[PDB]
Write an enzyme that holds these catalytic residues in place. Structure first.
Site, PDB file in Angstrom:
ATOM      1  CD  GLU A  96      -3.194  -0.848   2.121  1.00  0.00           C
ATOM      2  OE1 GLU A  96      -3.162   0.047   2.997  1.00  0.00           O
ATOM      3  OE2 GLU A  96      -4.042  -1.750   2.164  1.00  0.00           O
ATOM      4  CB  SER A 127      -5.724  -9.060  30.143  1.00  0.00           C
ATOM      5  OG  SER A 127      -5.147 -10.025  30.975  1.00  0.00           O
ATOM      6  CG  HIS A 134      -0.335  -6.933  43.329  1.00  0.00           C
ATOM      7  ND1 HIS A 134      -0.867  -6.693  44.562  1.00  0.00           N
ATOM      8  CD2 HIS A 134      -1.361  -7.352  42.560  1.00  0.00           C
ATOM      9  CE1 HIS A 134      -2.157  -6.981  44.554  1.00  0.00           C
ATOM     10  NE2 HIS A 134      -2.481  -7.373  43.348  1.00  0.00           N
ATOM     11  CB  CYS A 187      -3.686  -9.428  40.598  1.00  0.00           C
ATOM     12  SG  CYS A 187      -3.888  -8.275  39.263  1.00  0.00           S
TER      13      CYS A 187
HETATM   14  S1  SDQ Z   1      -5.697  -7.924  38.341  1.00  0.00           S
HETATM   15  C1  SDQ Z   1      -7.224  -7.163  37.677  1.00  0.00           C
HETATM   16  C2  SDQ Z   1      -7.652  -7.839  36.576  1.00  0.00           C
HETATM   17  C3  SDQ Z   1      -8.917  -7.644  36.050  1.00  0.00           C
HETATM   18  C4  SDQ Z   1      -9.369  -8.313  34.930  1.00  0.00           C
HETATM   19  C5  SDQ Z   1      -8.535  -9.220  34.319  1.00  0.00           C
HETATM   20  C6  SDQ Z   1      -7.264  -9.410  34.837  1.00  0.00           C
HETATM   21  C7  SDQ Z   1      -6.824  -8.746  35.967  1.00  0.00           C
END
Ligand code: SDQ
Length: 259
Positions: free
Chosen positions: A86, A182, A187, A205
């Site tokens: 392109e 995502s 943590h 998490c």
């Molecule tokens: S750790 C917060 C969280 C929300 C949706 C998907 C994954 C992690």
């Protein structure tokens, strides 16, 4: 109409055994095959690998299996003046060298609720963990370690999800190691130490102790691997951004240059 390639990991870096080569362009690539032919990857020890596109702007290359520790990788993105379709031309070349570090695989097993870190096959840490509660579970699969943050505010609205909505959230956490685009992290969660090793309380998490989360931050590096097993969740998507290894090799190898 120029497009600039950017290669990860950075030149001179040491990365874990899960780290793909990534070549990411600042424009949509109309001819994926043209981009692929312009990118030459050299490995020592030599290993086969293959290209797979995560989206229209980023291609990844990896081997069938995790890299062998100590592997030296050279990436030659020879795109200067190349027609990427392109009428879009490559703006420059990029040339990057990196090396694979120790094999660091941490497995979070929902049947034990323990996150075990293995360095070259040896357990170095066993961390009680609290993962996603049943309504917001942690996906099983292979996660590639990404960035790390001493302190970070995680606000769902960063993903277009209102905080005061069902999938919403807003929290700040210390010692955060990113393992999916995502928004899954390892943590510090001092407030769930009682539950760690017993009950899943999070939004997805991996909650661990302040000391364990700091350890993770200090000692787990980009490209190391987290595997989640035995949760009630689904599977991390192959195209998450750090979920590359969930695509079977036969599919990865076949690629998606015509898609
Ligand atoms: S750790 C917060 C969280 C929300 C949706 C998907 C994954 C992690």
């Amino acid at each position: 109409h120029l497009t600039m390639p950017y290669v990860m990991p950075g030149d001179g870096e040491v990365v874990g055994v899960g780290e793909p080569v990534a070549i990411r362009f600042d424009e949509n690539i109309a001819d994926r095959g043209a981009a692929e032919k312009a990118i030459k990857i050299t490995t020592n020890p030599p290993v086969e690998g293959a290209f797979y596109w995560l989206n229209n702007r980023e291609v990844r290359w990896r081997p069938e299996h995790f890299w062998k520790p100590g592997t030296a990788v050279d990436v030659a993105v020879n795109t200067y003046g190349v027609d990427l379709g392109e009428g879009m031309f490559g703006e420059d070349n990029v040339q990057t060298h990196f090396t694979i570090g120790d094999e660091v695989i941490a497995t979070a097993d929902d049947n034990t609720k323990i996150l075990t870190v293995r360095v070259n096959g040896e357990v170095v840490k066993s961390m009680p963990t609290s993962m996603g509660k049943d309504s917001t579970p942690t996906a099983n699969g292979i996660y590639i370690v990404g960035s790390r943050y001493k302190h970070i505010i995680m606000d769902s609205s960063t993903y277009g999800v209102p905080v005061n909505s069902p999938n919403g959230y807003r929290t700040d956490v210390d010692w955060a190691t990113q393992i999916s685009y995502s928004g899954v992290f390892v943590h510090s969660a001092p407030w769930s130490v009682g539950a760690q090793g017993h009950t899943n309380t999070s939004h997805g998490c991996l909650n661990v102790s302040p000391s364990n989360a700091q350890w993770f931050y200090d000692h787990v590096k980009r490209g190391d691997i987290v595997e989640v097993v035995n949760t009630v969740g689904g599977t991390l998507p192959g195209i998450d951004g750090l979920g590359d290894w969930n695509i079977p090799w036969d599919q990865w190898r076949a690629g998606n240059a015509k898609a």
